[PDB]
Amino acid sequence: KHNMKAFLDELKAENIKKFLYNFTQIPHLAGTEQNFQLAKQIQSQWKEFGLDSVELAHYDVLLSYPNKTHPNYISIINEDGNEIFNTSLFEPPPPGYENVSDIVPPFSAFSPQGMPEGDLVYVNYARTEDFFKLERDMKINCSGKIVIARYGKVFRGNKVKNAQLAGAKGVILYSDPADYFAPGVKSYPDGWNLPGGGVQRGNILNLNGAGDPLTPGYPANEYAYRRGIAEAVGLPSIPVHPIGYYDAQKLLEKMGGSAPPDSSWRGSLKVPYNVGPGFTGNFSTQKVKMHIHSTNEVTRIYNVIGTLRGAVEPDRYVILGGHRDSWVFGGIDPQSGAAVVHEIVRSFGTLKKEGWRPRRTILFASWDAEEFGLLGSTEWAEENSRLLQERGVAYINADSSIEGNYTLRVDCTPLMYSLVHNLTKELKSPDEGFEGKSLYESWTKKSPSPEFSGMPRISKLGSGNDFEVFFQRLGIASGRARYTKNNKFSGYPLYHSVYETYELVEKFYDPMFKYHLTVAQVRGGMVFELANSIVLPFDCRDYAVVLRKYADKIYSISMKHPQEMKTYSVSFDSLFSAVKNFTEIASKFSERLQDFDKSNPIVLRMMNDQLMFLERAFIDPLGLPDRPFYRHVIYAPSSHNKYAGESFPGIYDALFDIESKVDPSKAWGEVKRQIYVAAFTVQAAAETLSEVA
Amino acid sequence: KHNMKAFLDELKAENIKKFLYNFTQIPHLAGTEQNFQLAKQIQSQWKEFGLDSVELAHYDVLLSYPNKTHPNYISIINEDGNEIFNTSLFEPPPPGYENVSDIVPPFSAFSPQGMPEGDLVYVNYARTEDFFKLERDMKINCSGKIVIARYGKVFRGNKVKNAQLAGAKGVILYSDPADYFAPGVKSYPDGWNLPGGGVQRGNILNLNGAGDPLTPGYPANEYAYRRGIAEAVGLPSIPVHPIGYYDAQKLLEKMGGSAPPDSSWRGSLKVPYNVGPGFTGNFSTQKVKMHIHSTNEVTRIYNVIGTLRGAVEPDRYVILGGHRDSWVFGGIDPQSGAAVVHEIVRSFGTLKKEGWRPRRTILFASWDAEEFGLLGSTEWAEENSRLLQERGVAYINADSSIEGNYTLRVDCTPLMYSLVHNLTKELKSPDEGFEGKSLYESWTKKSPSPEFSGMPRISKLGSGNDFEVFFQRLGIASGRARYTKNNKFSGYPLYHSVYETYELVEKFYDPMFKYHLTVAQVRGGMVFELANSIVLPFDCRDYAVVLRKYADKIYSISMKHPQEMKTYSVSFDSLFSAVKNFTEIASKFSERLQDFDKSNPIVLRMMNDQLMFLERAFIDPLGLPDRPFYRHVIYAPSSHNKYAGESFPGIYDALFDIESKVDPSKAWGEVKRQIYVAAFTVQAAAETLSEVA
């Protein structure tokens, strides 16, 4: 028969392996011919595999590339203006790829051009708290300095924003072996560690959900009216460039001024990690000079969109999407995910050829330009937002299937928690020592929930991937799953480097493609249940549980300031009341969902619609303050780290560093305003689960 | 049996008459005890009539009232500062009401307090073009002047905004007999004309859809965080007061300075209509002084919400709403509408008691504080916006049932045009000379469509009533219908005066209550069809027809400026393309709607959902420029007259007075931006009617 087991058994490790090999032989950088040819290949194969329709959806968006005949580099310059040290113009290519053309050299996408020259300040990870320590405690002024920051802990766009607000005139990003060289493992090609010549590429925008910097709110189609560059969203104002740790050692070794304030500021290089500004006595007249000549240009990108029409509810969409563009070869990011999607489409297509169709429509997407700011998924969602917000059941992301080989990682809406627990109990663990045990069992053992005994950890969705528009803007229930290591936000060692290849995966991460297969079963199994369960597989009671946890957490932050809460009459009573009501109404809804007359398709659908629009109810059409495309009131990407999720973000940001605000009455008024908005939204979401009339 | 005919035949003229008498014996001003008692009466009666549930929904909103012990008035003051003429402190009460307490004296709701003293300028109707004529052609400067403006043509809030932007320090509004005294009819109590002591009350806010000035975006519930008054939405900055034409004659008779520029500036009083500034030679040292002491205060209001649960689709809402608060007795506005609603509820309830239920849920609303800015409907819709945008089929308004006795007036979405034509062909005309003929026949004869032979005129929805939040903010298909006269925006002569009483209606407008009954049959019949037709009674092809008409119209405005359209490459091609596509897709959708398998309730509902969400597709979640609560891209209230609808309002406002903008490149860029937004929205709406997968 045609059930989930049939679907799951058709998935093959050996197919994922062949697809990964096929997708990682040449670079597939967004906006290049190679990436368009791969799009056309995917489209053809998905048609072959049996999808009803497979189309390319193209957009013309702002991208950024280095100048081929005027390379980016950094120097140490002496008082004469002689360049006595230059950083490398490219990463040494890996074995057997030394003749591959069109490897893009390391650069920070969307950097402006410039040639700033100045004294260095070392700013650790360039986090908000690192700049607080520099400016408040150590009294070091970054104005007119070039800052040097180690990659890790937070999204690099936030480091750049923070440097810019500190008055920096340039930023140098580098990979410290503390964060990108695991002890006892060899550098690529002999192991999975970053070599000293390796460099992490990546964009440095602060889009806050906007998509193409030139067309916020609307798709970048053929007749789009663009903003001028000066009004574009999210572009940095200062030049930025990334380097490897051989080059970083040269720049750091001469640094003078103040000592590091403590050991959390020192990486693993043989240097003092002095904060500066500038170099020690002998070299105090030498400066650092950046040379950045990258250009921003409007460039066509292509999404592949495949449809498998639903037999019963064709107007309800379950979406499996992940990106196809890569920085270089994309051996992990994204092709380990894209190969998994390809095999999922192939398996669904096999069932379709035997006469089966899912209950609801499944949409499959191969997104472009994820690396330049989630541009392909965001522009497509802008184009199709009316269809998605009335018809979108769920979005499952499918970027990198592995970032380690230790255990499963899931980040998703609470509405999916039950679905994920149930599915993982039915899947086999691929882990050594758990032969014949469930994935749920191995995952819960290796990654226990901090709250609940006998449960696995499931994280909040943050951002930095293509689910952002669906979840944070549109309020469609979203999830993601991958295999992971034992700081999650820094990336694995060869992240966004030329060394992330097929061989990296086949030799060091997953030689038997068993972790890829397990990830295909989790993502595919989610999609299968979402598109085929009679009653949507969402449990509203799980949202009630987390809302109480988030309410407790935000109340606790505010309670650091008891005198102000008394003075300005700051009460969380309304939020706790709303959460109590949501808990009560959700419990009654769950009873009706179990009890309702199961022969009545209208009651079922009213109730499926209530389930589908529950995530939608958390959207505030006015958005969060100064972030109009982050509309979800429960979750937003952290204002300090795009990758991390923050709960009750409007109240969290109103409280953050509040003791430093010059007008406390106004600052606490805005806290109260955010409490009202949160309480109201929670109550309004609860009421969507009440009896409808 | 229980069909529409059963519903319609139960409606009785004599019941509407009794209800109107019952609702108009005492004032029902928003926020007063009397209006709360009437709310409680309605709630009790609707329960009696048989509704499933009838609740009050209350909010605490900003209202405005005169100071009882410090009355508002205007003087002419001589050079000594003696007040030589004072305007009246109240309207002479009508016969037999001279002992009614709590008649609010004439005032302009939300005026600030002040005592400005200065020279008068007469500004005709204080329209945008009247101020253009004064300032551009006649070179008269209104800065620091008190302006005097006749009521009529545009909403009074726009007159005040225009006066304020001209630098006026106060505004005096008055009713000219040209606009409020029909030739050959007697003044109240002997006919329906305004007496010289009569005065039109009314608010002067510019809310642009926001609702309560203190809580834009969110309901004014018990825990709401309010804006301070200085940040409130839409409050006027200068004092304003209305007067009758006996008093206006005193203020106008002495005016000097320039002559009126032409006869369209002269009303019917025996005065020159000089524009000023100031008085003629002999009186040139006399000034005009206002004394305004009204106060704004947060006050509780109450909506009554009645539910009649649907038998098949209880999660689909058809809403019949109209307001209950009045300025004084509300003989026409709103109780001629509220009596009609009451009789509709009674008729539906009779069918319900015999075992019938509508297919979809019908919600009935008695809104509060409409007169103070659509506050009750808007706050309730803010509270329930998630329910309404996923479940709202249609909204039928029910304010004044009559504003004349000549013919029917309908303003509605194009989606309702077919429904209205079909229903009116089945109703009897109440008109003299059309005995035994259809309402469609009398209406089409008396009010022919300017475009199509053998069709009646149906207007755009503008605003100035409680459908604004449902249509302009939420995108729920909306309509309104009333009996009317042969300028629609000025109001009938006794509008918002103490003279609008039961006797006015019973003696002069509708002695047999036959026009009330016809209006009950149109509004009730609409609600019946919307809540009971298997397939929703919306025809998308009618939207296609009007979109082409609006595209032609906006193109024609732009084509006044051919040189600029060449210079800045301003093309309407994308908008015409979108409209052509909408026309094609709508035609194919209509074929499927006729042809689809009528035994399949899922296809029916997919298709009912496509019909319901079509109006919703015209909403842009980013709103129009500086008007975030006007989100519909096809229709918005005119920026120059809240009562009037404007089509493609984003492009219309970008083009308006464009030849006066100092930076034409920037002005024409914004035209192009609005063309893109309009073309995209039309295409996106079209695509919601495509096959879903």
Ligand SMILES: *[C@@H]1O[C@H](CO)[C@@H](O[C@@H]2O[C@H](CO)[C@@H](O[C@@H]3O[C@H](CO[C@H]4O[C@H](CO)[C@@H](O)[C@H](O)[C@@H]4O)[C@@H](O)[C@H](O[C@H]4O[C@H](CO)[C@@H](O)[C@H](O)[C@@H]4O)[C@@H]3O)[C@H](O)[C@H]2NC(C)=O)[C@H](O)[C@H]1NC(C)=O
């Ligand atoms: C969690 O869910 C509960 C429902 O179980 C909600 O409880 C409501 O809470 C509000 C605000 O606290 C209550 O509001 C109060 O309403 C009183 C009148 O209520 C009656 O009439 C209404 C119709 O208008 C009916 O809906 C209702 O059933 C009652 O019959 C007012 O008199 C109250 O105002 C007075 O007291 C306050 C506070 O002291 C003063 O500020 C006022 O000036 C005034 O004197 C008040 O507005 C409401 O009755 C409750 N509904 C119930 C029990 O059904 C919670 O609101 C909800 N939590 C959230 C966050 O939404």
Ligand SMILES: *[C@@H]1O[C@H](CO)[C@@H](O[C@@H]2O[C@H](CO)[C@@H](O[C@@H]3O[C@H](CO[C@H]4O[C@H](CO)[C@@H](O)[C@H](O)[C@@H]4O)[C@@H](O)[C@H](O[C@H]4O[C@H](CO)[C@@H](O)[C@H](O)[C@@H]4O)[C@@H]3O)[C@H](O)[C@H]2NC(C)=O)[C@H](O)[C@H]1NC(C)=O
């Ligand atoms: C009204 O409805 C029609 C559909 O009937 C829409 O027509 C589309 O119009 C757009 C814009 O004019 C066309 O866009 C063009 O697409 C070409 C590629 O199209 C093929 O591949 C795509 C997948 O990517 C398929 O969807 C499609 O079926 C085709 O097989 C591009 O090559 C074009 O770009 C080139 O020309 C332009 C203009 O000269 C240059 O600016 C570019 O640099 C480039 O050289 C172009 O983008 C699209 O093909 C049409 N779709 C069709 C016919 O199905 C209208 O857009 C719609 N009106 C509105 C307002 O939406």
Ligand SMILES: *[C@@H]1O[C@H](CO)[C@@H](O[C@@H]2O[C@H](CO)[C@@H](O[C@@H]3O[C@H](CO)[C@@H](O)[C@H](O)[C@@H]3O)[C@H](O)[C@H]2NC(C)=O)[C@H](O)[C@H]1NC(C)=O
């Ligand atoms: C994940 O799996 C669990 C365990 O199977 C699912 O919960 C179970 O769901 C079924 C079907 O709704 C429940 O059965 C019902 O029991 C009541 C009697 O208590 C009866 O009235 C109903 O007719 C029906 O038989 C079962 O109680 C429930 N078990 C629990 C909550 O422990 C859960 O739904 C799954 N999650 C999904 C699909 O998202």
Ligand SMILES: *[C@@H]1O[C@H](CO)[C@@H](O[C@@H]2O[C@H](CO)[C@@H](O[C@@H]3O[C@H](CO)[C@@H](O)[C@H](O)[C@@H]3O)[C@H](O)[C@H]2NC(C)=O)[C@H](O)[C@H]1NC(C)=O
């Ligand atoms: C207003 O009334 C008109 C006139 O009755 C309605 O249009 C008519 O609608 C019916 C039912 O959809 C159409 O009948 C169909 O005819 C085709 C053959 O042409 C057949 O395939 C179908 O099975 C069905 O019998 C009829 O053609 C149509 N007449 C027109 C358009 O002139 C209209 O729907 C009403 N508007 C509403 C309810 O909003």
Ligand SMILES: *[C@@H]1O[C@H](CO)[C@@H](O[C@@H]2O[C@H](CO)[C@@H](O)[C@H](O)[C@H]2NC(C)=O)[C@H](O)[C@H]1NC(C)=O
């Ligand atoms: C990746 O796999 C695809 C599909 O098998 C290969 O593309 C095919 O190549 C053959 C031989 O050149 C052609 O006859 C077909 O037209 C291609 N099919 C397509 C594009 O759908 C592709 O060559 C493989 N790439 C690598 C690097 O191995």
Ligand SMILES: *[C@@H]1O[C@H](CO)[C@@H](O[C@@H]2O[C@H](CO)[C@@H](O)[C@H](O)[C@H]2NC(C)=O)[C@H](O)[C@H]1NC(C)=O
């Ligand atoms: C670093 O690179 C720069 C730029 O290529 C080198 O300086 C140039 O050297 C050439 C040839 O010797 C001169 O003609 C140019 O005038 C120099 N350009 C600039 C901008 O200074 C420099 O030699 C390199 N330094 C090291 C240590 O390799």
Ligand SMILES: *[C@@H]1O[C@H](CO)[C@@H](O[C@@H]2O[C@H](CO)[C@@H](O)[C@H](O)[C@H]2NC(C)=O)[C@H](O)[C@H]1NC(C)=O
């Ligand atoms: C308007 O009609 C209502 C309903 O008939 C009247 O209210 C009733 O009055 C009687 C006699 O005083 C009471 O016994 C009932 O309790 C009332 N019913 C209600 C409030 O539902 C009301 O008196 C009428 N008003 C006028 C001005 O005629």
Ligand SMILES: *[C@@H]1O[C@H](CO)[C@@H](O[C@@H]2O[C@H](CO)[C@@H](O)[C@H](O)[C@H]2NC(C)=O)[C@H](O)[C@H]1NC(C)=O
């Ligand atoms: C218009 O009204 C004002 C205010 O009531 C009158 O002026 C007042 O007259 C009283 C009693 O005669 C004096 O004590 C006050 O000093 C006056 N107040 C002000 C503000 O001037 C005035 O008489 C009235 N004018 C007419 C023509 O009736």
Ligand SMILES: CC(C)C[C@H](NC(=O)O[C@@H](CCC(=O)O)C(=O)O)C(=O)O
């Ligand atoms: C490795 C993690 C931390 C980040 C990784 N995402 C990612 O690399 O996306 C890109 C683009 C993300 C964005 O612009 O929001 C980036 O972070 O440079 C992921 O989600 O797998």
Ligand SMILES: CC(C)C[C@H](NC(=O)O[C@@H](CCC(=O)O)C(=O)O)C(=O)O
């Ligand atoms: C008589 C028409 C022009 C206006 C009338 N509406 C009306 O009186 O509403 C009030 C409040 C309208 C508002 O504040 O938007 C007013 O115009 O002062 C109606 O729609 O029947």
Ligand SMILES: *[C@@H]1O[C@H](CO)[C@@H](O)[C@H](O)[C@H]1NC(C)=O
């Ligand atoms: C890149 O640099 C070259 C040579 O230095 C120059 O001629 C050209 O203007 C630049 N290209 C772009 C795309 O800016």
Ligand SMILES: *[C@@H]1O[C@H](CO)[C@@H](O)[C@H](O)[C@H]1NC(C)=O
């Ligand atoms: C830092 O340096 C700049 C430039 O010299 C100066 O304008 C600014 O006031 C300084 N800021 C602090 C906080 O010391």
Ligand SMILES: *[C@@H]1O[C@H](CO)[C@@H](O)[C@H](O)[C@H]1NC(C)=O
């Ligand atoms: C794969 O698994 C082994 C066993 O724990 C581990 O030591 C090795 O480092 C893993 N590879 C990666 C890339 O994590």
Ligand SMILES: *[C@@H]1O[C@H](CO)[C@@H](O)[C@H](O)[C@H]1NC(C)=O
């Ligand atoms: C109204 O005026 C009276 C008497 O002139 C004054 O005592 C009171 O302050 C005012 N009332 C309000 C509500 O402002």
Ligand SMILES: *[C@@H]1O[C@H](CO)[C@@H](O)[C@H](O)[C@H]1NC(C)=O
């Ligand atoms: C009108 O009068 C004011 C005040 O005297 C003055 O500031 C302003 O410039 C004048 N405006 C015009 C357009 O003449």
Ligand SMILES: *[C@@H]1O[C@H](CO)[C@@H](O)[C@H](O)[C@H]1NC(C)=O
């Ligand atoms: C009622 O109808 C008659 C007949 O045309 C008309 O002359 C009279 O003025 C009407 N009343 C009103 C209030 O329009």
